[PDB]
Amino acid sequence: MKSVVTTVIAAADAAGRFPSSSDLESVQGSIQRAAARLEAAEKLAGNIDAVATEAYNACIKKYPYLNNAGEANSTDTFKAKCARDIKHYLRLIQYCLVVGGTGPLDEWGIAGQREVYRALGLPTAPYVEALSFARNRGCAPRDMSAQALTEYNALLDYAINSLS
Amino acid sequence: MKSVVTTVIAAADAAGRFPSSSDLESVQGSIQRAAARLEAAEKLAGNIDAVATEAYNACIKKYPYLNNAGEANSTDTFKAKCARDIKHYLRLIQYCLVVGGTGPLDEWGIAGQREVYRALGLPTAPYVEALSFARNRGCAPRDMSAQALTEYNALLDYAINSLS
Amino acid sequence: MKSVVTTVIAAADAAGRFPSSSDLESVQGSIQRAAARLEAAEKLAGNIDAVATEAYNACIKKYPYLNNAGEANSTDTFKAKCARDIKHYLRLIQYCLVVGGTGPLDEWGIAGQREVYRALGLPTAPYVEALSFARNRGCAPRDMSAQALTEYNALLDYAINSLS
Amino acid sequence: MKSVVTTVIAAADAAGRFPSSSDLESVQGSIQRAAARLEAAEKLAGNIDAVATEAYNACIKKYPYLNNAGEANSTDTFKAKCARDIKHYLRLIQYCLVVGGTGPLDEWGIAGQREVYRALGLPTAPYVEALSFARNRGCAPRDMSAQALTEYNALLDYAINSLS
Amino acid sequence: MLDAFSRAVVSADASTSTVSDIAALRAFVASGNRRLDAVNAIASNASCMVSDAVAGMICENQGLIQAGGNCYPNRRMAACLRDAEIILRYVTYALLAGDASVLDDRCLNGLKETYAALGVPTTSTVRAVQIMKAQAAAHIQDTPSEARAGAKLRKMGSPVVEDRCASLVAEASSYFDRVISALS
Amino acid sequence: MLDAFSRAVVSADASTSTVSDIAALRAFVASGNRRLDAVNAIASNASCMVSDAVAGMICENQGLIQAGGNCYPNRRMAACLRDAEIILRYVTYALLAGDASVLDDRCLNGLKETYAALGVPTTSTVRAVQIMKAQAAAHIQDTPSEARAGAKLRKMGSPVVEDRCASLVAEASSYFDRVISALS
Amino acid sequence: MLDAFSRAVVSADASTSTVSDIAALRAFVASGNRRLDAVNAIASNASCMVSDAVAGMICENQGLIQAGGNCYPNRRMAACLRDAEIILRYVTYALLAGDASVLDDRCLNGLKETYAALGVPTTSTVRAVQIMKAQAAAHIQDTPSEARAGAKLRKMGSPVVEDRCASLVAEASSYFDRVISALS
Amino acid sequence: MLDAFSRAVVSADASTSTVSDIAALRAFVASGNRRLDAVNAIASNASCMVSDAVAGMICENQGLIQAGGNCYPNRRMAACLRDAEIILRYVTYALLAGDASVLDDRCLNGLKETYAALGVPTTSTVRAVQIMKAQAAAHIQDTPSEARAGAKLRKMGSPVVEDRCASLVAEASSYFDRVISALS
Ligand SMILES: *C(=C)C1=C(C)[C@@H](Cc2[nH]c(/C=C3N=C(/C=C4\NC(=O)[C@H](C)[C@H]4[C@@H](*)C)C(C)=C\3CCC(=O)O)c(CCC(=O)O)c2C)NC1=O
Ligand SMILES: *C(=C)C1=C(C)[C@@H](Cc2[nH]c(/C=C3N=C(/C=C4\NC(=O)[C@H](C)[C@H]4[C@@H](*)C)C(C)=C\3CCC(=O)O)c(CCC(=O)O)c2C)NC1=O
Ligand SMILES: *C(=C)C1=C(C)[C@@H](Cc2[nH]c(/C=C3N=C(/C=C4\NC(=O)[C@H](C)[C@H]4[C@@H](*)C)C(C)=C\3CCC(=O)O)c(CCC(=O)O)c2C)NC1=O
Ligand SMILES: *C(=C)C1=C(C)[C@@H](Cc2[nH]c(/C=C3N=C(/C=C4\NC(=O)[C@H](C)[C@H]4[C@@H](*)C)C(C)=C\3CCC(=O)O)c(CCC(=O)O)c2C)NC1=O
Ligand SMILES: *[C@@H](C)[C@H]1/C(=C/C2=NC(=C\c3[nH]c(C[C@H]4NC(=O)C(C=C)=C4C)c(C)c3CCC(=O)O)/C(CCC(=O)O)=C2C)NC(=O)[C@@H]1C
Ligand SMILES: *[C@@H](C)[C@H]1/C(=C/C2=NC(=C\c3[nH]c(C[C@H]4NC(=O)C(C=C)=C4C)c(C)c3CCC(=O)O)/C(CCC(=O)O)=C2C)NC(=O)[C@@H]1C
Ligand SMILES: *[C@@H](C)[C@H]1/C(=C/C2=NC(=C\c3[nH]c(C[C@H]4NC(=O)C(C=C)=C4C)c(C)c3CCC(=O)O)/C(CCC(=O)O)=C2C)NC(=O)[C@@H]1C
Ligand SMILES: *[C@@H](C)[C@H]1/C(=C/C2=NC(=C\c3[nH]c(C[C@H]4NC(=O)C(C=C)=C4C)c(C)c3CCC(=O)O)/C(CCC(=O)O)=C2C)NC(=O)[C@@H]1C
Ligand SMILES: *[C@H](C)[C@H]1/C(=C/C2=NC(=C\c3[nH]c(C[C@H]4NC(=O)C(C=C)=C4C)c(C)c3CCC(=O)O)/C(CCC(=O)O)=C2C)NC(=O)[C@@H]1C
Ligand SMILES: *[C@H](C)[C@H]1/C(=C/C2=NC(=C\c3[nH]c(C[C@H]4NC(=O)C(C=C)=C4C)c(C)c3CCC(=O)O)/C(CCC(=O)O)=C2C)NC(=O)[C@@H]1C
Ligand SMILES: *[C@H](C)[C@H]1/C(=C/C2=NC(=C\c3[nH]c(C[C@H]4NC(=O)C(C=C)=C4C)c(C)c3CCC(=O)O)/C(CCC(=O)O)=C2C)NC(=O)[C@@H]1C
Ligand SMILES: *[C@H](C)[C@H]1/C(=C/C2=NC(=C\c3[nH]c(C[C@H]4NC(=O)C(C=C)=C4C)c(C)c3CCC(=O)O)/C(CCC(=O)O)=C2C)NC(=O)[C@@H]1C
Ligand SMILES: *[C@H](C)[C@H]1/C(=C/C2=NC(=C\c3[nH]c(C[C@H]4NC(=O)C(C=C)=C4C)c(C)c3CCC(=O)O)/C(CCC(=O)O)=C2C)NC(=O)[C@@H]1C
Ligand SMILES: *[C@H](C)[C@H]1/C(=C/C2=NC(=C\c3[nH]c(C[C@H]4NC(=O)C(C=C)=C4C)c(C)c3CCC(=O)O)/C(CCC(=O)O)=C2C)NC(=O)[C@@H]1C
């Protein structure tokens, strides 16, 4: 699961090395940055349902054709699954803020996403619009500190990039 | 040349990745630690001859047999080469403090050291004693700040470990 | 370029074999089937613009949101590129009917299609609808013989499968 | 076991492909050619003993030295084994006509034939003469249709080539 | 590969000397946070940059998507989008390291000869890299125009100074210029 | 590799056009059975052709089997028999496909440079290929002479026409001529 | 270089034999006048063929005359017109000689590598050569269309036969196909 | 591998829940500096620890260096010094990560079966690991005895608290105990 410490340990292990100067130095970066990303993680844990709901509502507002018979937002099951999927991405982003790396998003969200959406004829654009809405929504210090919001925005942009 | 930033770039490159959350976070560690290790690097640059000389004198004091005809400290050339070698190790440690990694010591000091010393019948014990003396010599805040001296001591212990 | 004859030659070459009983027998299949698929190839060459135009019109009729400002069918350039893309797929299908294999569609249409559409935010559904319309449109003997239309329909289904 | 259908399936499987246009087209060739080769297979099944006997008699007529003490046709056991071997090749040719490929001859006759004959000091020339006699013997429409005899002759030439 | 600091070490080792200009190294460290903002601005917007740069190259030269053009057919357009992303990735590595070594050694070494052998137009590639250089400059300064971005506009919200990291913009631009020099 | 049909497709794709000359493709199909007879005539007689061609090369140039000759010792004679069979195999592939691509790409590309590096005489190789070209012509026409075959004479029994597949003979001969051109 | 007759001599010299197939040589001589008509038809219309072929390549791929295109600027358009004329010249030499040696040795040897080194698109070049191949076929047959010629239409007035020199058309076409093969 | 934080994520994902206990994560971060001191204390003294631990195992069981003993001859003593260093390396990784995953997955999985197959005594190995566990405890607390160190004594100079990182000592000891459990 990619994080600061798993990256330096994997590089140390590939070369048969004990932790050295650069390994500890890297982890000092986590000690400095954790406050910002744990602030974001706590805000997102506290308010994920509201954040996910407004992102879901944004993507359906942009693509109302999804409501037409046979389209991806057209039944109660589809509507519930779509909103669930947005919450899945935000939960994986909460996990990345806890860990300080893309590992959880890489392994549990992004890997296979394109094969799944292609196989079920789910358009990618609504997913991108939902995340893009969430990316443009936040401001500091209203929602959280500038560095907390920077961390949150970077992980949203990372998910957006994975679908683009 | 192993450092915080070359390690995360090499791991990113192996996976075809842009720099991500954990890569920037790792480099924040360098931003926090640089003051301490650049303090050590500047002290060592300023006083390397005195530091190397007293380490050389310590290893000959421990192993006076090196002064006997045919032994490794017995001629003016040998004496000059031995003192030069201790200064080489300290210069490579200065480089490691600048870079925040073992790269310079790995590539320019440690690789081949045992083949060379074995081939010329140079005993390793005096090298270890010189570095070990240097490792035990420093104290904070006399010589430099506690964290500067921690970084210096870790690189001396790294060199010592490579010879042990 | 995958065809009956290139497939048996590639398998013969991998084993260091002269053409043998099964190789000539395979090519006899092409001699029997060529009339049907060359009938389809000639019809498609004769009428490709009309066939492509009605498939393009079908996909825009299904997804009129594509006409809205900023969407994939919203400018004269976009409209022309979309219609061009449908004609590209039909031209590659004409090539497959000439060759008696998926080679031309494999190498010139399908390889990279998903990377391109993802990168430009082109939804795949309209491509699938255009080909799906073309697949359901034809009937024998009106358009061509039953076996000609079987060959045409199989290559449309192959393209559809590649996008699904 | 090499045939039209096993060749196209093996090539499909190596590339992870469903059967496609060129695979079905290849099998249409088997549907057209089967009548000729099953006619040959049925004639050979019906008359293999007479066909094998006259080929055996031809090769001993060409190489009567084989009858001398210590040579390969010199005892009752040797005579019976030699005639049996000719019938083995003709049975494998019957199998190739059934299958529409060299598979049975490749796997059960040709693989190891040279190691066996070398190890037992069996000259190859009599085997070649027997098959060569069988190859030159047949005519259409007396023995079977022209295409049936073409199939039979091609498999005899294939066995001859394997020993040459 | 080297970074800005190991570059100073390699320069010093040419005279087996200690690194004495610690002031310059302290200056690198003091611009550390803005450097991380600059890398974050490119990485966060990389897909928008690549698709816009390759689309721009194509809207200026329509032959790339016509018979015999090197973004035709689908396979070649995909390969070209991949190469623009690769080049941008190595430029972002260079900016994170403060040194071109990784770009020079892992991306540019033999690139022209590879493109010559494949028939990839170096002219059109240079134009794609020019557009990415302009995009990168705007994203580092956090001044992308609505005219070029439309609904895809992004703001990073880095703390603003009057010069808007002119020094990092010049550095980033010099890495894109090494790509252009390597293909010219 | 290409066959005659994918050759027409690649030519058409140079102007992103449909293949319009379906009459020529129908002509290829109408000669399909005689083409299969032509491939069967070579494959069925390949061992006789190779041994006769290499033996012919040698009976015209005795130095190949004397001190310093390139069919001396046993290992080199074996390697040369192998190469004559390989060349004949790629020519039969080209005839089955109705296109030289497989011969050009998998056999002739770098052959001269390989032979130069090994000291294999291209002159004597050209003579072996000349004899195989003559053998192939006779077997396609089903007119091998008893004078050149003796007891090894074979008849294919293909249905005879006046021209004896002159067009297939010319095509087969043009593939052997590509080998000769590649070594000359 | 070789011509059709010295080609027969070089083939015979591979077995140090006399040329015995005088009938084939007499057949070459009997088509001598029509061969001179075929060369005259190309040489006499060469400027119209080159400008129409290069203009055709360009109207099918507009990128050649846009930023970064290889017929931009004036110097490159001029260089390309020169190359189309050179290729057509070597093809006409081959047709006059009845042998590709002069085309192979003096024009095609290293052409692909030169074009790779310069960034000249081989795809677009192949299209120019395709058009010249079609033009040459029509001029040899003395059947150029008014649709493609307009006021530039030329009639040679060679003595007509029903086949319109099909064999010379195929030969000329095979030389253009060697150019395309050399660049493909 | 997991670290302490991705361990919390994996636990939460078992109920597809967000990680809500941020207080525990803040507690991990607050002990970050002392954790880095603990890893530095082991890595900096690893050679002294390995040689003293293996020498200790041997001075308690002299059979390891007698006929049929598993540190006899030179090759086996070297292999054993290597294994003690490897085990200590994976324990230091686990302490740096705050999670045993890397130790369990990359070092302990199949270790007993490997040792069974080689004839490596698990008893004597457990003794080497016991000594390294005691050494690690002392170096983390910065209280190595002069009695066991002599002239090799090292002081780390970490800032002292009354408990001397009792919680990190227990954690480190639990990783050594996983090794012992895996071999017992
Ligand atoms: C084709 C008709 C055509 C194009 C396609 C387009 C290409 C182009 N783009 C620029 C400059 C920029 N584009 C940018 C891209 C983005 N801005 C954003 O906010 C999002 C995230 C992202 C993706 C859409 C940016 C940042 C720039 C920099 C300048 C600016 O912001 O205004 C250019 C200019 C190239 C140059 O200066 O040499 C071009 C040509 N243009 C077309 O004509
Ligand atoms: C050495 C003294 C010497 C030779 C050895 C021989 C080589 C040679 N062979 C030909 C022509 C042919 N040989 C053929 C071979 C076969 N015919 C058959 O029926 C069997 C199956 C097969 C193997 C024996 C064939 C078919 C030909 C074609 C012509 C024909 O049939 O008559 C040549 C002539 C080469 C040329 O024309 O350039 C040569 C030289 N000749 C020797 O002198
Ligand atoms: C772009 C808009 C464009 C072109 C430019 C043009 C190119 C083109 N030309 C041909 C075919 C021919 N052109 C010929 C030229 C001439 N005929 C004459 O009588 C004079 C002397 C000379 C100069 C004008 C000829 C002879 C031909 C051969 C065919 C014919 O006569 O009809 C093509 C056809 C290419 C092909 O078949 O592959 C092309 C594309 N076309 C354009 O679109
Ligand atoms: C055989 C005669 C024999 C031994 C060999 C020796 C082994 C042994 N060592 C310990 C405990 C420690 N040794 C330590 C090692 C070091 N101290 C340092 O400062 C340097 C860097 C390093 C190498 C010399 C340390 C730190 C300890 C921990 C305790 C302490 O410091 O006093 C043990 C005890 C293990 C246990 O308690 O089970 C043993 C057995 N002993 C021998 O008898
Ligand atoms: C040009 C690049 C920019 C710009 C950047 C500035 N950012 C400054 C400070 C700053 N940035 C960060 C975020 C950064 N640090 C990290 O550790 C990480 C991620 C791991 C990132 C992305 C921080 C934490 C800080 C410091 C806190 C603060 O000062 O707010 C900065 C101010 C300091 C300086 O002058 O360098 C600048 C200038 N500013 C510009 O005008 C353009 C848009
Ligand atoms: C020059 C090559 C020959 C020649 C060949 C002819 N054969 C003709 C027809 C024909 N051949 C076959 C056998 C072929 N078809 C297959 O499917 C397979 C194997 C899988 C093979 C080997 C068949 C079945 C047929 C068609 C039936 C028939 O017509 O008898 C043929 C006649 C048709 C035509 O004009 O092309 C010719 C000319 N003829 C010659 O004179 C030389 C020796
Ligand atoms: C395809 C090439 C043509 C075609 C050509 C024919 N020309 C024929 C005969 C012929 N041509 C010339 C002129 C030629 N001989 C020269 O010495 C020179 C210049 C120095 C040239 C350009 C002559 C003198 C003759 C012979 C006199 C005559 O027959 O009028 C010809 C007829 C003979 C034959 O069948 O080869 C042909 C076919 N005919 C065609 O249909 C296309 C357009
Ligand atoms: C048990 C492990 C020790 C012990 C450790 C403590 N260290 C404390 C503070 C501290 N240590 C460092 C160095 C460390 N941080 C890094 O970034 C790196 C390398 C990159 C290392 C090696 C720092 C920077 C600090 C913080 C500054 C300071 O407090 O001086 C510490 C105090 C904080 C706390 O209570 O957690 C402790 C306890 N102390 C002990 O008693 C044993 C010997
Ligand atoms: C700065 C003032 C901005 C701006 C901010 C506003 N956001 C408003 C409401 C709002 N924002 C969110 C997402 C936010 N809450 C979270 O929990 C997280 C992440 C954990 C984020 C990023 C939500 C869910 C809501 C609705 C509930 C609420 O009222 O907080 C908001 C209120 C107006 C509105 O609802 O549109 C403002 C003003 N608005 C701006 O234009 C500047 C640039
Ligand atoms: C803490 C108070 C120690 C201690 C320190 C002493 N070291 C003495 C002199 C000395 N130390 C060095 C090495 C030092 N100089 C550097 O530039 C660096 C690092 C870059 C280091 C580690 C040198 C070269 C010297 C001689 C020059 C000088 O006087 O500064 C020293 C003076 C008396 C003596 O020589 O022993 C002391 C007191 N001594 C202790 O007992 C505690 C534990
Ligand atoms: C069987 C009777 C069907 C059916 C057929 C209809 N299609 C109509 C027109 C039409 N179809 C195409 C596609 C067709 N043209 C081609 O060239 C090819 C293949 C190469 C295909 C598959 C086109 C382009 C057109 C328009 C031109 C034309 O009229 O031929 C059609 C006419 C009425 C209408 O537009 O619906 C019919 C009746 N319709 C059916 O209901 C059955 C099941
Ligand atoms: C886009 C701006 C171009 C363009 C690009 C094409 N590149 C093609 C393939 C290709 N690219 C490279 C270099 C690339 N690979 C690397 O690993 C690195 C650096 C680490 C880079 C920068 C290679 C080695 C290859 C060959 C491998 C392959 O074919 O995938 C390519 C396909 C060429 C072809 O096969 O025909 C294209 C089209 N094309 C354009 O027209 C613009 C200017
Ligand atoms: C026979 C007509 C020649 C002759 C031939 C020799 N070739 C020798 C080896 C050899 N041949 C090739 C090319 C060949 N290998 C392929 O894979 C292909 C095409 C796919 C072909 C056409 C290679 C690469 C090699 C080297 C490998 C090896 O040595 O087995 C050869 C042996 C040379 C040596 O090692 O001394 C010979 C003698 N020799 C003659 O004199 C006539 C003219
Ligand atoms: C036109 C169909 C092309 C195209 C052609 C260009 N060729 C350029 C220069 C060039 N061409 C050659 C080969 C040519 N010279 C010979 O002597 C022979 C044969 C005997 C041939 C066929 C050479 C050696 C050169 C380089 C030296 C020179 O300038 O003459 C060229 C200019 C390249 C440059 O300097 O950038 C062009 C543009 N360009 C096209 O876009 C179409 C496809």
XYZ file of N, CA, C and O in Angstrom, chain H residues 46-100:
220
model
N 23.973 -2.210 14.127
C 23.568 -3.529 13.593
C 24.759 -4.492 13.499
O 24.560 -5.680 13.850
N 25.927 -4.052 13.034
C 27.107 -4.951 12.881
C 27.535 -5.458 14.250
O 27.761 -6.663 14.392
N 27.633 -4.560 15.229
C 28.024 -4.945 16.598
C 26.978 -5.932 17.151
O 27.370 -6.957 17.751
N 25.695 -5.671 16.919
C 24.604 -6.531 17.430
C 24.717 -7.941 16.817
O 24.714 -8.940 17.569
N 24.850 -8.035 15.499
C 24.860 -9.346 14.793
C 26.068 -10.155 15.289
O 25.893 -11.325 15.679
N 27.265 -9.575 15.276
C 28.477 -10.361 15.586
C 28.416 -10.810 17.049
O 28.769 -11.961 17.329
N 27.906 -9.952 17.936
C 27.842 -10.245 19.391
C 26.761 -11.320 19.630
O 26.974 -12.201 20.488
N 25.661 -11.258 18.882
C 24.527 -12.183 19.050
C 24.947 -13.581 18.579
O 24.707 -14.575 19.314
N 25.599 -13.662 17.420
C 26.029 -14.968 16.846
C 27.171 -15.529 17.690
O 27.119 -16.731 18.018
N 28.118 -14.692 18.105
C 29.212 -15.097 19.017
C 28.632 -15.602 20.349
O 29.211 -16.549 20.914
N 27.545 -14.988 20.827
C 26.890 -15.353 22.094
C 26.223 -16.720 21.970
O 26.412 -17.592 22.838
N 25.461 -16.895 20.910
C 24.853 -18.199 20.570
C 25.947 -19.285 20.611
O 25.721 -20.357 21.228
N 27.109 -18.999 20.025
C 28.217 -19.984 19.875
C 28.906 -20.201 21.223
O 29.228 -21.361 21.530
N 29.121 -19.165 22.028
C 29.849 -19.364 23.306
C 28.966 -20.181 24.260
O 29.546 -20.871 25.119
N 27.641 -20.160 24.080
C 26.694 -20.977 24.881
C 26.550 -22.387 24.289
O 26.215 -23.283 25.046
N 26.784 -22.571 22.986
C 26.730 -23.910 22.343
C 27.925 -24.059 21.407
O 27.826 -23.640 20.243
N 29.001 -24.654 21.907
C 30.296 -24.855 21.214
C 30.154 -25.887 20.077
O 31.022 -25.900 19.179
N 29.111 -26.704 20.085
C 28.885 -27.702 19.035
C 28.655 -27.061 17.679
O 28.915 -27.714 16.664
N 28.181 -25.818 17.642
C 27.939 -25.093 16.371
C 29.238 -24.968 15.565
O 29.156 -24.916 14.337
N 30.391 -24.968 16.228
C 31.745 -24.803 15.613
C 32.600 -26.069 15.818
O 33.849 -25.968 15.791
N 31.975 -27.223 16.033
C 32.666 -28.531 16.080
C 32.125 -29.405 14.937
O 31.133 -29.003 14.293
N 32.740 -30.571 14.729
C 32.358 -31.522 13.659
C 30.831 -31.681 13.639
O 30.259 -31.994 14.671
N 30.233 -31.436 12.474
C 28.796 -31.614 12.204
C 27.959 -30.461 12.726
O 26.744 -30.556 12.621
N 28.572 -29.429 13.313
C 27.845 -28.249 13.819
C 27.452 -27.341 12.671
O 28.157 -27.323 11.648
N 26.359 -26.580 12.858
C 25.823 -25.846 11.718
C 26.449 -24.472 11.424
O 26.057 -23.831 10.455
N 27.426 -24.050 12.238
C 28.297 -22.927 11.915
C 29.696 -23.406 11.488
O 30.653 -22.607 11.559
N 29.812 -24.667 11.068
C 31.050 -25.296 10.545
C 30.748 -25.839 9.151
O 29.727 -26.494 8.960
N 31.597 -25.621 8.132
C 32.823 -24.831 8.260
C 32.618 -23.329 7.987
O 31.585 -22.824 8.319
N 33.605 -22.650 7.412
C 33.592 -21.177 7.189
C 32.298 -20.762 6.475
O 31.656 -19.816 6.916
N 31.940 -21.446 5.401
C 30.734 -21.167 4.577
C 29.480 -21.078 5.473
O 28.632 -20.175 5.249
N 29.345 -21.968 6.456
C 28.127 -21.996 7.310
C 28.148 -20.842 8.320
O 27.102 -20.189 8.482
N 29.286 -20.572 8.956
C 29.398 -19.398 9.839
C 28.998 -18.132 9.060
O 28.242 -17.308 9.599
N 29.493 -17.969 7.836
C 29.177 -16.787 6.995
C 27.662 -16.735 6.714
O 27.067 -15.642 6.840
N 27.062 -17.877 6.354
C 25.611 -17.960 6.047
C 24.790 -17.540 7.280
O 23.772 -16.854 7.124
N 25.251 -17.919 8.464
C 24.543 -17.659 9.733
C 24.655 -16.178 10.086
O 23.634 -15.572 10.446
N 25.844 -15.597 9.976
C 26.007 -14.131 10.159
C 25.071 -13.386 9.207
O 24.449 -12.410 9.639
N 24.961 -13.839 7.966
C 24.062 -13.233 6.953
C 22.610 -13.323 7.444
O 21.908 -12.317 7.380
N 22.181 -14.483 7.942
C 20.766 -14.678 8.364
C 20.424 -13.805 9.571
O 19.310 -13.248 9.587
N 21.330 -13.685 10.544
C 21.100 -12.830 11.720
C 20.923 -11.381 11.253
O 19.991 -10.706 11.731
N 21.739 -10.931 10.309
C 21.635 -9.559 9.759
C 20.283 -9.413 9.028
O 19.598 -8.387 9.208
N 19.879 -10.406 8.242
C 18.618 -10.339 7.456
C 17.448 -10.197 8.432
O 16.604 -9.300 8.263
N 17.391 -11.087 9.410
C 16.292 -11.068 10.407
C 16.283 -9.681 11.081
O 15.212 -9.078 11.192
N 17.446 -9.163 11.486
C 17.492 -7.866 12.197
C 16.993 -6.768 11.242
O 16.270 -5.843 11.699
N 17.327 -6.880 9.957
C 16.917 -5.879 8.946
C 15.385 -5.861 8.869
O 14.789 -4.755 8.932
N 14.743 -7.027 8.762
C 13.268 -7.082 8.611
C 12.602 -6.580 9.912
O 11.539 -5.927 9.854
N 13.218 -6.826 11.061
C 12.670 -6.328 12.352
C 12.754 -4.798 12.354
O 11.792 -4.144 12.837
N 13.849 -4.230 11.854
C 14.004 -2.759 11.823
C 12.983 -2.175 10.842
O 12.471 -1.097 11.132
N 12.689 -2.870 9.741
C 11.661 -2.410 8.766
C 10.308 -2.327 9.481
O 9.602 -1.281 9.365
N 9.966 -3.393 10.204
C 8.686 -3.478 10.947
C 8.590 -2.317 11.955
O 7.518 -1.733 12.075
N 9.677 -2.022 12.666
C 9.700 -0.930 13.657
C 9.561 0.415 12.930
O 8.872 1.303 13.447
N 10.162 0.576 11.764
C 10.067 1.868 11.020
C 8.626 2.048 10.535
O 8.131 3.186 10.594
N 7.970 0.959 10.114
C 6.599 0.971 9.565
C 5.549 0.995 10.679
O 4.387 1.353 10.402
N 5.908 0.546 11.870
C 4.928 0.307 12.941
C 3.962 -0.800 12.600
O 2.803 -0.709 13.039
N 4.431 -1.826 11.887
C 3.593 -2.976 11.472
C 4.486 -4.168 11.069
O 5.522 -3.978 10.420
N 4.064 -5.377 11.425
C 4.830 -6.625 11.238
C 4.637 -7.187 9.827
O 5.365 -8.149 9.484
